Symmetry: C3
């Protein structure tokens, strides 16, 4: 066996039976102590017949399927570090809890044999990232790990066009589910083309041929936020450009800039930002569950 | 066997016998419906005793050695998509035709056991690419695929010095055949040093030791355009700087900029641009055929 | 056996016995013809019970443990090329001597089974590197080669914050030995956080779990220069900003800029620059020897 991995009975049975599983990250389970969200998300994933697998680090182990005991700790403990792939080693050595990010979670999901992962938005090239080189580790982790990541594109505070250019340079396939424009998190679209897939069985056959030809690597399937739930591009951009405008005059750069952009976004959105992010989270999870079903059936032939 | 790959009898026999083969891309076979070019190119490759292998996608298959029927379609069909490595999966799933680029073709060539690929110019860092991050997927595909790519350096509309810096960061060997300056497509030189190889058997022994030590990865062998056939650096640069000058005042960026640079180049060159690109294509193909012969003999010891 | 590698008896015995070995680069053995330095360095490494393995290229071979004859040549021959990983193939084919850099040496160390490498400073993103793309091949070589590199961070003429951002994007773990700020070569600190490891056995268990989960790749363990021996950040920066100020007015960019920065540094430091670099070299080598001992013991369980 594997001495680092602890996989729940349900997930281990689904994998043994080549049934559909969808991985979920823990780094944000922390952002909703309720849980109510995790419950709508599990429901969205199972509605397709997929098994949800929430992932994190605890006790020197990579945990696939957190126990209720564990979800409780992740919900209620103050000090929990966010763990990208490069932090996994130290999180294991330390023996405490670690809430894994996109890059951290997909490496653990892949190690267990899970092939689909979902979240509302991935990391990317930050705004002014062509100058500061502040770019999420998710983008190059997608050159190594065999995974389909289903999301609503990059998070809104990031630079959508630069992230799309970087993924193209990195050779990472970017598909749009029923669209040929890149999803822009709580904003419907960025003016960036992607390859339209109208059907998830076609997307799954494309992903499978991608792995067979190019080897282990991530396929990004973007699915935009429901049009009824979108935030106005103008509102998002003006709020962000102003938040950056205050950054220059108060002279803040570095890891300080990014959490200001996040708070400025909450503010401009009435109080709708959480509501829009939840809608995107739910619809993306549904698509991930349906995609994972369609991939199990493709790999079955 | 392999269920994705269709290899012609001639190429399959040369490979079985460890005889020299040189891959060619289809994405540009489309740019010369004649054929006359493809015919001079085949002649240049065979003159060294190498077998030319033109590659593309058709009918759910990776095709190595296009049939006359297929070359005809690629010559005469309007809608044919250009396929980089990240597009291979969807091109296969779709079952139509796909004309593969440098990155797309070398992955298929490698899968068949071909080790040498040639084209007039590779992709690279685009001009202003330090700011726009518009950089060809070819450069990072060279970190994965075992191949020697023989070209006249990067295409002229690209930024030669930035492409050379990026390849150095990527650990991709860059050799100059009988020169210690980087080839600049239809321009003889960029002011960028490369490692001179005066002899192709020495270059082949260097490539082989590179693969043995560093693993699968591409070696770039650059061979400049004949001095009688070069375009004046000043002519190229002035034309490009002006084409960019019009871009700023008419406010065009994105994937719009690049095809303007290409047309501005045709214009400044009298009508010699096609003539110079063909000469570079022919001399590079000859060097590729001779290199491929010298590598088969090296691997034979 | 391996036909490219020549490993001395002492190193081959330590490896066979899974005892601690630390690799050293030759590219700088050239920078101190004395030797006296190499002798203090060997002493610092052995004090921990590790075996020092100096590496280079000679006679068509990758040499692990240079002979006295070889150290003499590297000390006394004028023309010796510096060999990064991408130059290994041509250095072998040429049959002459080659002094390997960080990237070149760790690939050879890994091939022999050595897992720890040390040097005073690694390459990184050069100053203005966000615009010139001048970035050391060491940073992406760390995505491929299984190694712990122990250093005092990046060399002082480089951009510390950009190098740290680039390593984060590349997924390369960056630990600080008893510190949570990045080491800045002869300067104690850059204002850049790293993950503190207070104990080398914990660092070794983190590195081992990193390799087990993320596969072959480099772990960077940074150890700052003794506070008694540091150069004043202000002195370093003012000297560098002025050296760059003269570069703009005398219009020098390219590979010309970097050796000016190096000479301007010698000048501002009284004559202490060599003295500070030697102290950093000695203390980093000690930490490398102790780390390598602690890793052999971890891998023994
Ligand atoms: Ca960052
Ligand atoms: Ca692009
Ligand atoms: Ca810039
Ligand atoms: Ca460089
Ligand atoms: Cl794009
Ligand atoms: Cl260069
Ligand atoms: Cl950082």
């Amino acid at each position: 066996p594997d001495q680092l991995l602890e996989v729940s009975d349900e997930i281990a049975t689904a994998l043994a039976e080549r049934r559909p599983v969808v991985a979920l990250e823990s780094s944000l389970i922390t952002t909703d102590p309720s849980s109510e969200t995790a419950s709508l998300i599990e429901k969205a994933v199972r509605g397709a017949g997929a098994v949800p697998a929430t992932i994190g680090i605890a006790g020197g182990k990579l945990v696939v399927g957190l126990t209720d005991s564990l979800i409780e700790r992740f919900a209620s403990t103050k000090g929990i570090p966010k763990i990208s792939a490069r932090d996994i080693g130290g999180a294991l050595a330390g023996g405490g809890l670690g809430a894994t990010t996109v890059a951290g979670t997909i490496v653990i999901a892949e190690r267990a044999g899970i092939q689909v992962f979902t979240t509302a938005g991935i990391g990317g090239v930050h705004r002014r990232g062509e100058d500061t080189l502040d770019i999420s580790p998710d983008l190059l982790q997608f050159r190594k790990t065999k995974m389909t990541v289903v999301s609503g594109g990059a998070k809104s505070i990031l630079d959508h066009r630069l992230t799309a250019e970087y993924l193209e340079t990195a050779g990472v396939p970017v598909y749009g589910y029923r669209t040929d424009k890149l999803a822009a998190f709580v904003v419907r679209e960025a003016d960036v083309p992607v390859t339209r897939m109208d059907d998830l069985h076609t997307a799954a056959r494309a992903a499978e041929a991608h792995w067979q030809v190019n080897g282990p690597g991530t396929v990004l399937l973007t699915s935009p936020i429901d049009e009824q739930d979108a935030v106005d591009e103008a509102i998002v951009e003006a709020a962000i450009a102003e938040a950056l405008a205050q950054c220059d005059q108060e002279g803040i750069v570095g890891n300080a800039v990014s959490p200001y952009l996040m708070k400025a976004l909450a503010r401009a959105s009435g109080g709708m930002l959480p509501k829009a992010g939840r809608s995107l989270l739910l619809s993306t999870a549904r698509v991930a569950g349906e995609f994972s079903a369609a991939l199990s059936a493709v790999q079955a032939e």
